[PDB]
Amino acid sequence: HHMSYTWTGALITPCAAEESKLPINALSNSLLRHHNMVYATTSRSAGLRQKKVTFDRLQVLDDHYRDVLKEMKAKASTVKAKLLSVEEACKLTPPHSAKSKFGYGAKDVRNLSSKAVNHIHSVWKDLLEDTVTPIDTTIMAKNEVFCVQPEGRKPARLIVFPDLGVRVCEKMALYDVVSTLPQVVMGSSYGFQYSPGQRVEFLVNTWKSKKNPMGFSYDTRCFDSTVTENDIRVEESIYQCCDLAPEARQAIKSLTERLYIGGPLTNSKGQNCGYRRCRASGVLTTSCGNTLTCYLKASAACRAAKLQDCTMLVNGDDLVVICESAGTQEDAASLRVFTEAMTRYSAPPGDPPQPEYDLELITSCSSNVSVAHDASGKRVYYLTRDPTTPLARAAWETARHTPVNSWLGNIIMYAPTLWARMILMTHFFSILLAQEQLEKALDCQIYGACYSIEPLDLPQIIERLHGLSAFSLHSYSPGEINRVASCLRKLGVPPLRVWRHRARSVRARLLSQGGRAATCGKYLFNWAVKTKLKLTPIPAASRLDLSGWFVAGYSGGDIYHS
Ligand SMILES: [Zn+2]
């Protein structure tokens, strides 16, 4: 047997008390009334998750697989990557990253304190000398917020991560590799090179490039658990194709043998929970490995299915394919063959894929293309998503400070959307005004990495990522309007006419503050008035350093880019 996990029966334990019920304050009702619809996952459901993620993996690897792999390795061989110094790697550590078990924390690391640096060096030396001993990991249940979907409650997802010292060593060995290799190997198919607008451009251009377009998303069941020892060694063989220093080569070999392939699982109480033989969700290579492995399996599956003129877009375990239609029956047939190949590769689907002939109806990375109209009346395509989870998370953040501010990330990613503009902007700017906290920088995450963002910089950030049109879109699609309306009914969110009324108040209060606050009032809330101000390029926008923002995925990888 080739089991993803083996377990001792020891429990996955929490670090602090965990809340599952939505916390309520005086502001909660202004956002939503159906409080019992929002929950957070806790370690209490960890056993249910363990059951779901534990299975035997079988893998049959054919000529299509090896052909694509050869191609990937040929591209990888053009990459030159560098070792990061200790200091460079230390500066990439989030200020609140989990402290080391060895007597120092993330602040000590960021400050280059002697004890941290010395220990990191000792971890590094040990990686070079020893390429066999499994490195310890901690297993935790993630506390994440969702809306109930009777389609009831998700069990908590699991996070598996090594000690802080090792994580700094992972950056040193592989940060440059995971940041540069995937776009070289996968080209335009690598999803994390795109801002949301650029992703939309690629998808729309790809769709228009087909005579008779068909598209489909592919949902792998428990992707991390599907990743085998084979997959992880194949990933390492790809990394090693790069032009690397011998010390980097040795560290990558060692991290592969000792950490990436598998290792002991330890709870928060120091007890042995069992043993992992699949992808660790909390390592630097999580996003890059998943993306490469998904792309490899899917590219080979496309060949097996004989899909005509197909283009892929891959973000970790998330996959969308757009190809040439051969008719509805022939397409259904192709997807069945595609699915069979993926399954043989260890990657069977949760929901079976279905052919889609309307681009707007294809969901990938929880998102879809939709269309609205700019100030001139021109059709504009933009990225959107079902607002349920963003709004459930905003409900939580209304009553509780959290390490990651999802509302702020969601405004950045989904600025052009009806719901981010009318609800998220209005609600959160009301709150920040009330506490006079417009100037206070908040942590958020973009493609897995951590940023400290000042809400007063939102107009310039949005202009840079989405263009000026994000401040003037109107006439959204009836499909998008219905979806938003359905979500508001479900969660008990006030109707859009109430948000319009509130936004006029927010806009006025922001304008009354002048400076950056007034720019926010002017640009972010121009949709809320009949008396529309003239929106011109903001000078500060061109000065914003937004490099590294949409380059690569770092989910689980403990990266701070501020
Ligand atoms: Zn065997």
Contact of 447 with 553, CB cutoff 8 Å: yes
Dihedral of CA 283/284/289/290: which sign?
Answer: positive
CA of 530 to the centre of ligand 1 (A): 69
Pair of tokens at residue 237 = 């063989």
User: Which residue in 172, 174, 167, 169 sits closest to 97, CA to CA?
Assistant: 167
Instruction: Quote the longest CA-to-CA distance of the chain.
Output: 70
Given its phi and psi angles, is residue 190 left (phi above 0), alpha (psi -120 to 50 degrees) or beta?
Answer: beta
- Beta-carbon contacts of 118 under 8 Å, excluding residues fewer than 6 positions away, are none
Report angle CA 18, 136, 47 to the nearest 5 degrees.
Answer: 40
Residues 214, 239 share a domain: no
CA of 297 to the centre of ligand 1 (A): 20
Angle between helices 63-76 and 164-186 (to 10 degrees): 100
User: Which residue in 321, 295, 297 sits closest to 310, CA to CA?
Assistant: 321
- The amino acid present at 76, given as its one-letter code, is A
Tokens 């560290």 correspond to: 251
CA of 58 to the centre of ligand 1 (A): 9
Helix (H) or strand (E) holding 91: helix 86-91
SS3 state at 34: coil
Helix (H) or strand (E) holding 398: helix 388-399
Q: How many CB atoms lie within 10 A of CB 504?
A: 15
Residues 431, 319 share a domain: no
Contact of 335 with 354, CB cutoff 8 Å: yes
Residues 70, 33 share a domain: no
Q: Cα(541)–Cα(216) distance, rounded to whole angstroms?
A: 37
User: Which residue in 388, 418, 433 sits closest to 406, CA to CA?
Assistant: 388
Tokens 């380059």 correspond to: 551
φ, ψ for residue 327, nearest 5 deg: 100, 160
Residues 196, 223 share a domain: yes
Residues 34, 93 share a domain: no
How many whole angstroms from its chain centre is CA 388? 17
Pair of tokens at residue 284 = 């630097």
* 317-352 burial: b if 16+ Cβ within 10 Å, else e: bbbbbbbbbeeeeebeebbeebbebbbbbbbbbeee
Contact of 557 with 173, CB cutoff 8 Å: no
Q: Cα(259)–Cα(293) distance, rounded to whole angstroms?
A: 17
φ, ψ for residue 393, nearest 5 deg: -65, -40
Residues 248, 361 share a domain: no
Three-state SS annotation for 280-291: CCCCCCHHHHHH
Q: How many CB atoms lie within 10 A of CB 292?
A: 27
DSSP state of 193: G
SS3 state at 468: helix
Output the known binding site for Mg(2+): 219, 317-318
φ, ψ for residue 426, nearest 5 deg: -60, -50
Residues 322, 440 share a domain: no
Q: How was this structure determined?
A: X-ray
> How many CA atoms does the CB half-sphere of 227 hold within 13 Å?
31
CA of 57 to the centre of ligand 1 (A): 9
Q: Cα(384)–Cα(480) distance, rounded to whole angstroms?
A: 9
CA of 60 to the centre of ligand 1 (A): 12
φ, ψ for residue 252, nearest 5 deg: -65, -45
φ, ψ for residue 259, nearest 5 deg: -130, -55
Strand partners, 216: 321
Output the known binding site: 219, 317-318
Burial of residue 25 (number of CB atoms within 10 Å: 0-12, 13-18, 19+): exposed
Q: How many CB atoms lie within 10 A of CB 202?
A: 18
Residues 432, 300 share a domain: no
What's the chain's Rg over C-alpha atoms?
24
* 384-407 burial: b if 16+ Cβ within 10 Å, else e: bbbbbbbbbbbbbbbeeeeeebbb
Pair of tokens at residue 306 = 């004989």
Q: How many CB atoms lie within 10 A of CB 489?
A: 11
308: domain CATH number? 3.30.70.270
Residues 534, 426 share a domain: yes
CA of 61 to the centre of ligand 1 (A): 14
- Beta-carbon contacts of 308 under 8 Å, excluding residues fewer than 6 positions away, are 323, 324, 326
Dihedral of CA 519/523/525/531: which sign?
Answer: positive
Q: Cα(405)–Cα(393) distance, rounded to whole angstroms?
A: 9
Q: Cα(431)–Cα(409) distance, rounded to whole angstroms?
A: 17
CA of 242 to the centre of ligand 1 (A): 31
* One-character DSSP codes across 322-386: EEE---HHHHHHHHHHHHHHHHHTT--BSSPP--BS-GGG--BTTEEEEEEE-TTS-EEEEEEE-
* One-character DSSP codes across 486-532: HHHHHHTPPPHHHHHHHHHHHHHHHHTT-HHHHHHHHHHTGGG-SSP
Pair of tokens at residue 286 = 């999580």
Q: How many CB atoms lie within 10 A of CB 63?
A: 10
- The amino acid present at 561, given as its one-letter code, is H
Contact of 205 with 188, CB cutoff 8 Å: no
Contact of 68 with 312, CB cutoff 8 Å: no
CA of 2 to the centre of ligand 1 (A): 6
Please tell me the total number of residues recorded for the chain in this structure: 562
User: How far lies 328's CA from each of 132, 210, 307, in Å?
Assistant: 52, 15, 13
CA of 236 to the centre of ligand 1 (A): 21
Residues 62, 51 share a domain: no
Residues 293, 317 share a domain: yes
CA of 1 to the centre of ligand 1 (A): 6
Residues 400, 535 share a domain: yes
CA of 364 to the centre of ligand 1 (A): 34
Residue 119 structural domain: 57-133+163-186+228-261+278-284
Total domains, the chain: 4
Tokens 């602090």 correspond to: 16
